[PDB]
Amino acid sequence: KSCCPNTTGRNIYNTCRFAGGSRERCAKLSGCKIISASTCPSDYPK
Numbered sequence: 001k002s003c004c005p006n007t008t009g010r011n012i013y014n015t016c017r018f019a020g021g022s023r024e025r026c027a028k029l030s031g032c033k034i035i036s037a038s039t040c041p042s043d044y045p046k
Contacts, residue, residue, distance in 0.1 A: 001038060004031070005043070005046065009030045
């Protein structure tokens with residue numbers, strides 16, 4: 001799943017995805033990660 005620091009991270013990620021940027025590119029850009037671990041560390045709580 002995708003995992004972001006905060007709501008602004010989610011906002012930027014979603015906007016970039018809506019425009020049509022790649023998932024990891026949008027994640028990096030916004031300051032989020034994406035991992036196949038399903039569980040994310042207590043650092044990206046959104």
